[PDB]
Paper text:
Twenty-S rRNA accumulation 1 (Tsr1) is an essential 40S subunit biogenesis factor with homology to characterized GTPases. Tsr1 is a key nucleo-cytoplasmic pre-40S ribosome biogenesis factor that is essential for the final maturation of 20S rRNA to 18S rRNA91014. However, Tsr1 lacks all the conserved motifs required for guanine nucleotide binding and GTP hydrolysis, and is therefore a structural mimic of translational GTPases rather than a functional enzyme. Since Tsr1 is not catalytically active these data suggest that, rather than acting as a molecular switch, Tsr1 is a molecular gatekeeper that must be removed before key sites can be accessed to catalyse the final stages of pre-40S maturation.
We reasoned that this segment might hinder crystallization, so we generated a ‘loop-out' mutant (Tsr1Δloop), in which residues 410–476 of Tsr1 were replaced with a short glycine- and serine-rich sequence. A further deletion of sequence predicted to be natively unstructured at the N terminus (Tsr1ΔNΔloop) improved diffraction quality, generating native crystals that diffracted to 3.6 Å. We found that Tsr1ΔNΔloop complements loss of wild-type Tsr1 in yeast, showing that the N terminus and acidic loop are dispensable for Tsr1 function in vivo. Comparison of the four molecules in the asymmetric unit shows only limited differences between them (root mean squared deviation (r.m.s.d.) values range from 0.9 to 1.1 Å) suggesting that the overall domain arrangement of Tsr1 is fixed. Tsr1 is characterized by four domains that pack together to form a chalice-like structure. The second, third and fourth domains (II–IV) are β-barrels. Domain II has a large insertion segment that wraps around the centre of the molecule. Comparison of Tsr1 with EF-Tu shows that Tsr1 has a domain arrangement similar to EF-Tu in its GTP-bound, active form.
Residue numbers in the entry: 67 to 117, 120 to 312, 335 to 365, 369 to 380, 479 to 761, 763 to 787
The structure:
Amino acid sequence: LDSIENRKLFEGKNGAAKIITIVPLVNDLDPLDILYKLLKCADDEGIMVQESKRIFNVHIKKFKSNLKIIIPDMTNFLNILDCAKVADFVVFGLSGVQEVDEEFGEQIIRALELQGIASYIGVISNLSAVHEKEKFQLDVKQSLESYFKHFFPSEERVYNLEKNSDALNVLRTLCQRLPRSINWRDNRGYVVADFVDFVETSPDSGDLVIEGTVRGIGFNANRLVHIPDFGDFQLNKIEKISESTVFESNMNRDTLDEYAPEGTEDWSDYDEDFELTTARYDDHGFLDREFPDEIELEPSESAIERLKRYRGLKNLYNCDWQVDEKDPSSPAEWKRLLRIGNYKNTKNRIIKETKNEAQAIAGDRIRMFIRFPKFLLEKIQDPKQLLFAVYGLLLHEHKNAVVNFSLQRWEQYDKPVPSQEPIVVQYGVRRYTIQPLFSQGSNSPNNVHKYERFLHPDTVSVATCIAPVDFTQSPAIFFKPSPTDAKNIELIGHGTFLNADHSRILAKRAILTGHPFRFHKTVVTVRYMFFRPEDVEWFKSIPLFTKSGRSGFIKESLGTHGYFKATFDGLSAQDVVAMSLYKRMWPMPSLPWNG
């Protein structure tokens, strides 16, 4: 009972700011018409919009509450998403004449829902164009209502802005009804800039002043800040405006370092240094998919040199594979990454620390001085036209680490997706061009997982890469920018930022194909596997298997052309002799994404 009074206060007084985003899901639907029909309900004529251009601050006197209306750039799909993630309420605009495009309008409903929506409302301003008779118009309104309920059953009736009865009910909801909270946005800080100015300090960099009201967890002078399509930046000063305090950047401020100082690799020896006449074999445990992992050796090149970093495994679930081991293939950044022991506990601690050590709480008007470089000012667009939102970053969020994303294919995405090709990933407001190693999610004791070359279509897979830490487990949207597509991007998949564990070891499989030709009572001769007698001698330790379900071992080399004799438990001139080998796959560093 007490909690309801405290939660209302920030928005139910002369110092409130309610973010409302107008999202018309149809090509031939104007957002200004949707706004005019919504602002018509209030008796104050001086509220009405003509020629602020897209982002307006309107004070509705009928419900004694300030409203902040945002109109996105419909040419850019990502801008529509950007305006909605900052919104407290989203006004979806449906058309009576034109149907919602599956490739664009429908995809907006899909993408906004997957990145996180605070509150939604169905609205029709195009009902007049259908018919003159109310019997024909209501049949169209009911048809749109069934479509809107299919995406989310939270809304039962799609309000029509034509009738003053339904339009007054919408404004009453946008002004009085408390909006829902978005986990990642509200646990961070978020300020929608009303006015942006710049102060020169040096001929290279200065201070970018942002005036706005704090929403979410709040802001701290030491904590880093993030401007979308610009990057992460450090703060210098923050001024609090109160109706009848200044917080400065300390010695304990966060650094803009992506990786640890060059030399950190020399201060820790968690390395399994390994030194042989026979190839490596790990037998610690108890004993479509084959085709993509199959490999074929070249006759000129030796298999010892090619498959040097490969290990034979009796069982991948029980093998003693180790993290941080000595390997030349491993990235240089590996030791310079953020190593989090227990993500679950570090995530809760930083969140609790941020809320408790917050300087400018939600509802406070602030003047944010951001240490900004002068060269980036040419890309800054008017805050009244294009949404200028500043999202606060938690402790060590800038720092890169071995991050794990859960990812499921976007509905009706039959196209394949390989596990090394660059894909843009939007986790929260941040977006980076990620090269993700896919692996099927499993509860293995050794945390060793088989590296899948392509995204599995039946279930949800796990993408592993090197990217900065997200301490809010923000939902992730995976896309590839397409120029041929209506919306400048081609949405690949959706998911969530799982954790930041390096303990997840990924192993690439290599299956050697071999064909038997000669058959003695016990001695079976295979030929298409190796092409050197030395190569046969080296891989002798790794047991052989057959696609028919037989098991065996290499006896010795026959000729100088890699022919070999082998003994099996059960095969003919039609069976395929095979050998499975495994190598460690290291995560790949990712670059940021703007525009």
